[PDB]
Amino acid sequence: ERIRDLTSVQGVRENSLIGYGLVVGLDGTGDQTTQTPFTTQTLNNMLSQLGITVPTGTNMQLKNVAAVMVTASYPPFARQGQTIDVVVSSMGNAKSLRGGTLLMTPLKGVDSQVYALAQGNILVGGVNQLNGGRITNGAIIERELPTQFGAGNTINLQLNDEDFTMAQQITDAINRARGYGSATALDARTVQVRVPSGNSSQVRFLADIQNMEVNVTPQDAKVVINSRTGSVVMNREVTLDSCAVAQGNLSVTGGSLQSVRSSANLNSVVRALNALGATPMDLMSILQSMQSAGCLRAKLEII
């Protein structure tokens, strides 16, 4: 509940798979084949594999076919015959993929070898995006990747965020639950755990570890500003000193300078900032200038 929500097991990771395919059955929303020659070329390749040899030179104008790219996530410890979901995105100048059907598509990784075959029906919500869709259980795994799991006697747990204090807390929790030399902290997001040999013993050890509960120590104070979406999110550890704030078209409810008192609690910070009565767009400039002046104590990150 806490170990599985804060750390990851070494050697347990996902991968990316990509492929190219075609979507048929569209209601006149396919791309212009006069401007995209790869659609007609791959259609001729598919027909020649099937057994139909169209002559070259003759023009083909299609309205129900769209060239697409297919993306998928390869799960850890994957076996052949299992099903994964895929994301289908239109390339070229197609209009919409409403009620389409994806044909056979090889899914290859960065090693240029196949790992999955994809075929299914595209679901579009139908504002909403029209050139993108998702197929549930649309691809079947057909190649397994060997793993180093089971061998050795040590396994590393990798934290999502770097912290010496959190890694020490995780190591102390494992040590007080299992035994003295159960775990060893290597660095701020790497904790090494000693496990017995054999696959069944390691699986049982990881099942007992992953559902442990560990208190979460207070973290670094941080204020995040997203100017593209117009959002400002603060943290529970953010404090404030006493300073003076001047801002265009703002006044005390009557001078132009507004005084902000020193605040330790988060509710005091929210009360002091809402006393200014500013929009979030102006609040971004106020927070940036306050961090430059040193009155703001949290670190400022602009995403």
Add this chain to the structure above:
Amino acid sequence: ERIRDLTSVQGVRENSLIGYGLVVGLDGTGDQTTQTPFTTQTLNNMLSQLGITVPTGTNMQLKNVAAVMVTASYPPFARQGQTIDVVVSSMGNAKSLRGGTLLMTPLKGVDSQVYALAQGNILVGGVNQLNGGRITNGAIIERELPTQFGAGNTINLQLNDEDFTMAQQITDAINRARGYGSATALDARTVQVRVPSGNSSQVRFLADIQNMEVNVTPQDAKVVINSRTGSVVMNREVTLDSCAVAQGNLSVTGGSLQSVRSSANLNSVVRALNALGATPMDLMSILQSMQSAGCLRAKLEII
């Protein structure tokens, strides 16, 4: 009820079949044969196989014929003579497939060998898609695929989702139901079960296993955002810390900063988020910035 709803048997998997065919009997909704030469070419091939040798060079304009692609799913342990459903999708520039009839169509896999023959009537709902349809029991299996089932003494159960704790629970359930050395956990989505030799013993063992009941352990907290369909779905394990939220055109029912208290239960999270009074479109940006700030505890996935 639980084993069959969470795991799959090794060697039991579906496959994909594809083919090319024609649909006749349309009410003037066929594709333009002047722009699609493959329709007229395959019609000449069909007539020449039947015995009619049309001369070349002469133009043919048709309104009742549409070129289509046929997709099908090959079931496990399939026998010749059985029936499966097929999906018919129009290629080219056809208008609709309302009240059409599909002729004979070979269905081939990736090995370029036939496995099924398809012929039937297309059902269209009749907004609704017009270039796609489904035929129930429209194809007959005519080639059987050999299997390795029955031999050996071990069989692997493959989990749908990777979890060491769930695999340990499944192994413990099988061990307390059947015997001591009945099952062995290999990895996070692979459990090996020892079975006696012979096909009848393995079938009886799988029939007893598949209807077992196993409690489902709590999973990882995860929040899923689909921006294309405009949906946000949270999980039962999602928790929240205390933070501050600022957002354009939002205010307390009167400052711009809104305080969100720390929440453990899911109902408290829903109550705290509905106190903001934001649209789901704005809630996506709020949740993304909250996960970047670390106030959100669940992992965020954008599908």
Add this chain to the structure above:
Amino acid sequence: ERIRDLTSVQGVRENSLIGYGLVVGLDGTGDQTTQTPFTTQTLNNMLSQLGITVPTGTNMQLKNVAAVMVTASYPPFARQGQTIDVVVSSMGNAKSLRGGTLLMTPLKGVDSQVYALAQGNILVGGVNQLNGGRITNGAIIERELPTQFGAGNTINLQLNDEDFTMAQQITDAINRARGYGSATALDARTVQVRVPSGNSSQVRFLADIQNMEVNVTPQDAKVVINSRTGSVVMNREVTLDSCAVAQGNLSVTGGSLQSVRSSANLNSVVRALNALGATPMDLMSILQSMQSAGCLRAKLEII
């Protein structure tokens, strides 16, 4: 709570990663391919790697593809398999990246070697920016960087702001908490701490150090002016002498000269400045002329 909010550990730092990629699945908002040849050239490269060899010379007009640059932050002590967030920014003349999907993209540093692979879905808030987006956990680390952490017996703490008094306070706090020769102040933002050998001992020492509480000494008086955003922020240590202020279109509530008394407290400064009754735009010129006259005591910084 205070050491982690004021200092950084030597050898613990982030890095920058950049890469080039493509976004597909757009609803007709891609860039003009007739003016950007690199989009079509890289699309041909991707198809040739996949296996499709389009002929040269033929024109391709696309509406769903946009060339983008991907930026990412490499975290300290990163392990392969971990996930980081990426920022996707459009280059060229694309319209919007609403509901797009990013394909595979290598992320390289300044050494021209790969460190992460990025693939995912772009989330746009949807005024708001349309050519920029952020993907949460969109990239996977695939190369680890060796570190010098664990060796040696001394570790340097680097202050965010230079101060001899603050460095002395941090050194005295560590000395009264741990022992006599625990820490040594090197310079105004560098404090050397002696630690025992071994990774586990250093991790435990840093976990005990980082959550210590240390009083913050008064800092230098400083007034920050941002003329681009129109904001003026003062400090708690700012004092004022007695002077006379003349300003266009300003008068006593009735001569043109307004007298400002000497002020020590910050509230007295705010009261004396609000007695002038000037806009912040005029207040910038007033503060600059006051600092030139020497009546203002704080140092003036224009950001």
Add this chain to the structure above:
Amino acid sequence: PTGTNMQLKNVAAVMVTASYPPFARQGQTIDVVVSSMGNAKSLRGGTLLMTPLKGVDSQVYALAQGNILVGGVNQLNGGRITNGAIIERELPTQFGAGNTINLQLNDEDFTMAQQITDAINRARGYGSATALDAR
């Protein structure tokens, strides 16, 4: 290939300025100021790529990458990024050696320098400080 025309609407050439702090260590973060050159319209919601920051010795000292914050009257071709650059080269200093250190006044005054010297002398000891000149 060369020769082919490229018309772009989302790219702007900029100059980046930064202040190198005293006693700087590699890995520390500083703020940068981004100013547009050429004929760009605005830098609203932009993203700065990798940029080497060099001094007058034509050697690199910091690498800058981040997101530009514009207030959005207000300036549109200028912006500021907080902690947008990372120090990567340290400058050696003469601090620590010797036995004398000079304090430099902001404004020249013989009387103020005498007052500072007298304050240090009455706080620490007799030969603690010596006034050289007016600042």
Add this chain to the structure above:
Amino acid sequence: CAWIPAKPLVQGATTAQPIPGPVPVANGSIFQSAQPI
């Protein structure tokens, strides 16, 4: 005579062998500056 030996105008070796870079210090920085002039 053409068979008489004569030194060319450009003497010495006409090409150079590149030198591999130094071993990078295992700090936290991907940036590894060479020795500057």
